[PDB]
Design a protein around this nucleic acid. Structure first.
Ligand SMILES: [Mg+2]
Ligand SMILES: [Mg+2]
Ligand SMILES: [Mg+2]
Ligand SMILES: [Mg+2]
Ligand SMILES: [Mg+2]
Ligand SMILES: [Mg+2]
Ligand SMILES: [Mg+2]
Ligand SMILES: [Mg+2]
Ligand SMILES: [Mg+2]
Ligand SMILES: [Mg+2]
Ligand SMILES: [Mg+2]
Ligand SMILES: [Mg+2]
Ligand SMILES: [Mg+2]
Ligand SMILES: [Mg+2]
Ligand SMILES: [Mg+2]
Ligand SMILES: [Mg+2]
Ligand SMILES: [Mg+2]
Ligand SMILES: [Mg+2]
Ligand SMILES: [Mg+2]
Ligand SMILES: [Mg+2]
Ligand SMILES: [Mg+2]
Ligand SMILES: [Mg+2]
Ligand SMILES: [Mg+2]
Ligand SMILES: [Mg+2]
Ligand SMILES: [Mg+2]
Ligand SMILES: [Mg+2]
Ligand SMILES: [Mg+2]
Ligand SMILES: [Mg+2]
Ligand SMILES: [Mg+2]
Ligand SMILES: [Mg+2]
Ligand SMILES: [Mg+2]
Ligand SMILES: [Mg+2]
Ligand SMILES: [Mg+2]
Ligand SMILES: [Mg+2]
Ligand SMILES: [Mg+2]
Ligand SMILES: [Mg+2]
Ligand SMILES: [Mg+2]
Ligand SMILES: [Mg+2]
Ligand SMILES: [Mg+2]
Ligand SMILES: [Mg+2]
Ligand SMILES: [Mg+2]
Ligand SMILES: [Mg+2]
Ligand SMILES: [Mg+2]
Ligand SMILES: [Mg+2]
Ligand SMILES: [Mg+2]
Ligand SMILES: [Mg+2]
Ligand SMILES: [Mg+2]
Ligand SMILES: [Mg+2]
Ligand SMILES: [Mg+2]
Ligand SMILES: [Mg+2]
Ligand SMILES: [Mg+2]
Ligand SMILES: [Mg+2]
Ligand SMILES: [Mg+2]
Ligand SMILES: [Mg+2]
Ligand SMILES: [Mg+2]
Ligand SMILES: [Mg+2]
Ligand SMILES: [Mg+2]
Ligand SMILES: [Mg+2]
Ligand SMILES: [Mg+2]
Ligand SMILES: [Mg+2]
Ligand SMILES: [Mg+2]
Ligand SMILES: [Mg+2]
Ligand SMILES: [Mg+2]
Ligand SMILES: [Mg+2]
Ligand SMILES: [Mg+2]
Ligand SMILES: [Mg+2]
Ligand SMILES: [Mg+2]
Ligand SMILES: [Mg+2]
Ligand SMILES: [Mg+2]
Ligand SMILES: [Mg+2]
Ligand SMILES: [Mg+2]
Ligand SMILES: [Mg+2]
Ligand SMILES: [Mg+2]
Ligand SMILES: [Mg+2]
Ligand SMILES: [Mg+2]
Ligand SMILES: [Mg+2]
Ligand SMILES: [Mg+2]
Ligand SMILES: [Mg+2]
Ligand SMILES: [Mg+2]
Ligand SMILES: [Mg+2]
Ligand SMILES: [Mg+2]
Ligand SMILES: [Mg+2]
Ligand SMILES: [Mg+2]
Ligand SMILES: [Mg+2]
Ligand SMILES: [Mg+2]
Ligand SMILES: [Mg+2]
Ligand SMILES: [Mg+2]
Ligand SMILES: [Mg+2]
Ligand SMILES: [Mg+2]
Ligand SMILES: [Mg+2]
Ligand SMILES: [Mg+2]
Ligand SMILES: [Mg+2]
Ligand SMILES: [Mg+2]
Ligand SMILES: [Mg+2]
Ligand SMILES: [Mg+2]
Ligand SMILES: [Mg+2]
Ligand SMILES: [Mg+2]
Ligand SMILES: [Mg+2]
Ligand SMILES: [Mg+2]
Ligand SMILES: [Mg+2]
Ligand SMILES: [Zn+2]
Ligand SMILES: [Zn+2]
Lengths: 110, 181, 117, 141, 53, 69
RNA sequence: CGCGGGGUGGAGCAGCCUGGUAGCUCGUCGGGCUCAUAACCCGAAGGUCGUCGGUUCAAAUCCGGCCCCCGCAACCA
RNA sequence: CGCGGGGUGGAGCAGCCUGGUAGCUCGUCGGGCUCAUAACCCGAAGGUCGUCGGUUCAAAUCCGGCCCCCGCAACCA
RNA sequence: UCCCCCGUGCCCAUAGCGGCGUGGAACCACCCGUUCCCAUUCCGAACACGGAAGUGAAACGCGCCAGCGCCGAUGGUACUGGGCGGGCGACCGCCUGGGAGAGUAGGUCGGUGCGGGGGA
RNA sequence: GGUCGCCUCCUAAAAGGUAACGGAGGCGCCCAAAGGUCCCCUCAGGCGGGACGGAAAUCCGCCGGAGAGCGCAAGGGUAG
């Protein structure tokens, strides 16, 4: 048995995993949003940015933009520039979008 | 969100009675209406006229929502029925728009029907929900006789969080659902 | 749905339009009108709701009508068939109850003609 | 006359008859049974024939069990015709029996009665046979 | 194919060359076939239309 | 709500055949009805109405006893 | 054994190719004419399509097996 | 592929050359006569004149394209 | 470096179904609202956005129990690569190496990787 | 008499291949969406409840790993 939730997840995640790039995963809780970057070859998170960890607040979308930007800072430092965006079970829009838009001008190539 | 009549009777009268009747510990345990779905199972408009939109305008009138189509799943010969033929309407009432339909139903619709002698008690779902059938549809007040071509019934389904019929029986009886026996 | 449960014909007089209920005839029409001072020759449409509400709340209560009436008539007949009276047997066969000739006619009680070689 | 009610396929290849019986080697119902000593295609005619013989022997009484069933279609080309031009027609059904397979069983009839009845039955069968009594070994299986 | 599922060429409207050949159902889609397609001659894309095979 | 297909819903006044005013919301702001929730015979306690015992029947028929016991 | 045709109201034949819908003549039953019978006129009933399977939303109709009837074939020695 | 001519009411149909009328027979309906049956006779319903575009005061009648049925002749590696 | 939670892989049911219990500090979830972005062949159910009054009822996490499901030896046998023997014949049998399936004993209410948040 | 090319399954003896006038079936098409992509959705069936409404029309609830669907025969594949 499966929720449409889970089905979407696998469906969008698998497609990205095939392209073999680094993976920018995202979690979007009611109160926060989190974004880690994963090497699925080794199965390991290389760098992570989040609202909770940023001790951040001030409207979800505007917040989301920053965690992306912050994510790029720690990423580019390590050497990461090329990446693929795991949009999870979430429609590419609003909060998730803002995270991407931030992480974009933050320097990430995607 | 919007102050309405029936919602007040539930929240200020139905709720507590239920609590003292089954001794609910947690607040969300208390049974509540989830949604009300109207379904005019036509198919009388199968190959026939697209004048199911008359029944659709009549429908949207009663509910205050635009009704969606339902079309043939499989084709059936005995029914003169092609897979994909428009054969019904369905509209899902939630939140406040639900509360309004139920208020006008318990108060104005259900009495105005020919020889009303109570709702069927046995018609309970077995897992907390309830189903009934109308044949008229001028029975709703906002439908004068002049608007009607031919008669048309509909299938009302009312869905509650009630674990069982007992809890469901009570939630409905207390709201104003008149039962027959 | 207006009175007692089914909308009597508008545009036609009161005395007449009353008849169109399973329970009222010209007799109860002639009468029920008088007991609420309704103008006997006024069309249903011409009726003020003042006149309407009064003749509505009147008749519904005063007499057994329609479904409840018919169910009672039906329940009346069921009684006959159960005990086994002659009229009860005549209802069992569908034959003429009120003591008649069946050699000819009697076809209203038993419908269409069923010819045999 | 035994034969399948319905059949996925009408003609069936012949096959070999390797080994001992695959299973159905222990008495499972009555007190005595008839066991196959050598393998064969047991015809539906023979099954029925044995069946009748026992029935007849203890006229009215006891119950007969039949642990074999003819599901294999047996083919035969017509008389006096040559090889080739298709496979022959189905002309009957057999049950493939192998040594160790209990084929019949009886119950609720006296020991002597059972012995004669099962004995006569074997005489109808195209193979050597032995009668057996239900054992501690059978109930253990 | 058949009398009804027919063969046809796609002709570039810009320079009138036929650069592709395909099919269609005549009964189902009875109109000429309009389609953008690359033209090797014009070296761009072009609206091509159906042309009797 | 996907508007542009839905009928507006203004406050409604359904005064019935017993004067019983019930305000609510509906498509029509003015609508009338005969019998209602209040004045329906089934709803009101039980109401004899005109059904009392199905006529002077059966053993309770009276109108007899030609005896002086 | 081989090949082709056929089985549809009581009788005799259409409809199958192209799936949805059962027709014709006779007979039969009821009513007319006639003193009566027939001829004649009016009106009606009657099959669940050989039998099993299968395809299909749907089968007299398309596909496989079996049964009965019909025609053709069965030569070289 | 190249020619020739048709589509007109339910069936068949001259009207088309020569632009002003959707006409004829058969079919169905009603009425007359009838032993009846036909035939006869009076009336009547029934069409965008294949499509779409075009010359014209107006065209089934004349043009261009297109659909379709029949027809003519030739070709088929 | 032990404990709890969140995201995420790997092993692919010994991990599952079902039952009973536990958890809201934090996280997470239901939850609150429909102004805005977005959305419903009807419905803010879903998707989406702005929130934080309430609640762990649901969901989820963590436990516990073996009815189900799942896993499942050893021992023995079927069958068999190779080498042989007996019988007119049907078929049997021997050495050597390999060796199931079923069933019996029995196991199981998961185990682990990387990052994030919170603890003692 | 039947057959003649192509496809599916068995025969085929656990790689590939393998014969017979051996056992079963199909093809000579089709689709301007039945194609490309992006986004969303998940079956069949069972039980219960529901005016006309039935075994089966459309609606509600619970169950359900795939027994449905995938134009067409069969096989393989397939709801991550
Ligand atoms: Mg499952
Ligand atoms: Mg999904
Ligand atoms: Mg999916
Ligand atoms: Mg790994
Ligand atoms: Mg800030
Ligand atoms: Mg910016
Ligand atoms: Mg760059
Ligand atoms: Mg509101
Ligand atoms: Mg309360
Ligand atoms: Mg219908
Ligand atoms: Mg009344
Ligand atoms: Mg009766
Ligand atoms: Mg009479
Ligand atoms: Mg059987
Ligand atoms: Mg052998
Ligand atoms: Mg063996
Ligand atoms: Mg052996
Ligand atoms: Mg052996
Ligand atoms: Mg065996
Ligand atoms: Mg005995
Ligand atoms: Mg013997
Ligand atoms: Mg023994
Ligand atoms: Mg013993
Ligand atoms: Mg035992
Ligand atoms: Mg251009
Ligand atoms: Mg064309
Ligand atoms: Mg161009
Ligand atoms: Mg009141
Ligand atoms: Mg009361
Ligand atoms: Mg012939
Ligand atoms: Mg032929
Ligand atoms: Mg013939
Ligand atoms: Mg034949
Ligand atoms: Mg035949
Ligand atoms: Mg026939
Ligand atoms: Mg005949
Ligand atoms: Mg003939
Ligand atoms: Mg035929
Ligand atoms: Mg034919
Ligand atoms: Mg006669
Ligand atoms: Mg005569
Ligand atoms: Mg069938
Ligand atoms: Mg038929
Ligand atoms: Mg059949
Ligand atoms: Mg037939
Ligand atoms: Mg046949
Ligand atoms: Mg010769
Ligand atoms: Mg010679
Ligand atoms: Mg002619
Ligand atoms: Mg430690
Ligand atoms: Mg983990
Ligand atoms: Mg592992
Ligand atoms: Mg699992
Ligand atoms: Mg349990
Ligand atoms: Mg327990
Ligand atoms: Mg407990
Ligand atoms: Mg416990
Ligand atoms: Mg406890
Ligand atoms: Mg808190
Ligand atoms: Mg605001
Ligand atoms: Mg607005
Ligand atoms: Mg807006
Ligand atoms: Mg958009
Ligand atoms: Mg919008
Ligand atoms: Mg639609
Ligand atoms: Mg839409
Ligand atoms: Mg739990
Ligand atoms: Mg237990
Ligand atoms: Mg167990
Ligand atoms: Mg397994
Ligand atoms: Mg072992
Ligand atoms: Mg060993
Ligand atoms: Mg060996
Ligand atoms: Mg060996
Ligand atoms: Mg040897
Ligand atoms: Mg030897
Ligand atoms: Mg031996
Ligand atoms: Mg030796
Ligand atoms: Mg040796
Ligand atoms: Mg060994
Ligand atoms: Mg060995
Ligand atoms: Mg345990
Ligand atoms: Mg477990
Ligand atoms: Mg568990
Ligand atoms: Mg543990
Ligand atoms: Mg380790
Ligand atoms: Mg030949
Ligand atoms: Mg091989
Ligand atoms: Mg198509
Ligand atoms: Mg979508
Ligand atoms: Mg969708
Ligand atoms: Mg279902
Ligand atoms: Mg049901
Ligand atoms: Mg149903
Ligand atoms: Mg019906
Ligand atoms: Mg449904
Ligand atoms: Mg299956
Ligand atoms: Mg299906
Ligand atoms: Mg599947
Ligand atoms: Mg499948
Ligand atoms: Zn070009
Ligand atoms: Zn009132």
């Amino acid at each position: 048995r499966l929720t449409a939730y889970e089905r979407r997840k696998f469906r969008v995640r698998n497609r990205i995993k095939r392209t073999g790039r680094l993976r920018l995963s995202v979690f979007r809780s009611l109160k926060h949003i989190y974004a880690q970057i994963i090497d699925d070859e080794k199965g390991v998170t290389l760098v992570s940015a989040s609202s909770l960890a940023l001790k951040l607040k001030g409207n979800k979308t505007e917040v989301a933009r920053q965690v992306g930007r912050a994510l790029a800072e720690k990423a580019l430092a390590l050497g990461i520039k090329q990446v693929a965006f795991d949009r999870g079970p979430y429609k590419y829009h609003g909060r998730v979008k803002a995270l991407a838009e931030g992480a974009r001008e933050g320097g990430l190539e995607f | 969100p919007l102050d309405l009549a029936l919602k007040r009777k539930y929240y200020e009268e139905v709720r507590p009675e239920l609590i003292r009747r089954f001794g609910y510990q947690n607040v969300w345990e208390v049974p509540r209406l989830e949604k009300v779905v109207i379904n005019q199972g036509l198919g009388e408009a199968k190959e026939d006229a697209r004048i199911l939109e008359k029944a659709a305008q009549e429908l949207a009138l009663i509910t205050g929502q635009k009704p969606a189509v339902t079309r043939a799943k499989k084709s059936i010969s005995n029914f003169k029925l092609r897979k994909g033929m428009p054969i019904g309407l369905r509209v899902t009432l939630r939140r406040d728009r639900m509360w309004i339909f139920l208020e006008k139903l318990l108060n104005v619709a259900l009495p105005r029907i020919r020889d009303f002698r109570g709702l069927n008690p046995n018609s309970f779902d077995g897992r907390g929900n309830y189903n009934l059938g109308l044949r008229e549809q001028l029975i709703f007040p906002e439908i004068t006789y002049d608007m009607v071509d031919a008669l048309r019934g509909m299938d009302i389904a009312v869905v509650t969080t009630a674990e069982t019929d007992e809890e469901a029986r009570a939630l409905l009886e207390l709201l104003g659902f008149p039962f027959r026996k | 749905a207006r009175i007692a449960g089914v909308e009597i014909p508008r545009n036609k007089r009161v005395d007449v339009a009353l008849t169109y209920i399973y329970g009222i005839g010209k007799a109860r029409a002639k009468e029920a009108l008088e007991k609420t001072g309704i103008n006997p020759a006024t069309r249903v449409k011409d009726l003020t709701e003042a006149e309407v509400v009064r003749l509505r709340e009147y008749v519904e209560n005063t007499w057994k009508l329609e479904g409840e009436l018919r169910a009672e008539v039906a329940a009346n007949i069921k009684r006959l068939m159960d005990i086994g009276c002659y009229r009860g047997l005549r209802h069992r066969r569908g034959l003429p109850v009120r003591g008649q000739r069946t050699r000819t006619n009697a076809r209203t009680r038993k419908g269409p003609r069923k010819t045999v070689a | 006359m035994l034969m399948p009610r319905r059949m996925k396929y009408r003609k069936q290849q012949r096959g070999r008859l390797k080994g001992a019986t695959k299973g159905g080697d222990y008495v499972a119902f009555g007190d005595f049974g008839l066991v196959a000593l050598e393998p064969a295609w047991i015809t539906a005619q023979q099954i029925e024939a044995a069946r009748v013989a026992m029935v007849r022997h203890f006229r009215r009484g006891g119950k007969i069990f039949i642990r074999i069933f003819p599901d294999k279609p047996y083919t035969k080309k017509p008389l006096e015709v040559r090889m080739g031009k298709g496979k022959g027609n189905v002309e009957g059904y057999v049950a493939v029996v192998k040594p160790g397979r209990v084929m019949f069983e009886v119950a609720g009839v006296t020991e002597e009665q059972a012995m004669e009845a099962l004995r006569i039955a074997g005489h109808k069968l195209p193979i050597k046979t032995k009668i057996v009594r239900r054992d501690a070994y059978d109930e253990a299986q | 194919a058949s009398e009804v599922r027919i063969k046809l060429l796609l002709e570039c409207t810009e320079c009138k060359r036929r650069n592709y050949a395909t099919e269609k159902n005549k009964r189902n889609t009875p109109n000429k076939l309009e389609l953008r397609k690359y033209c090797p001659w014009c070296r761009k894309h072009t609206v091509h239309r159906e042309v009797k095979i | 709500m996907k508007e542009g297909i839905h009928p507006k819903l203004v406050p409604a006044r359904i005064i019935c055949g017993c004067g019983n005013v019930i305000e609510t919301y509906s498509t029509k702001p003015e609508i009338y009805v005969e019998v209602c929730s209040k004045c329906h015979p089934f709803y009101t306690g039980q109401q004899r109405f005109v059904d009392t015992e199905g006529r002077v029947e059966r053993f309770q028929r009276r109108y007899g006893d030609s005896y002086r016991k």
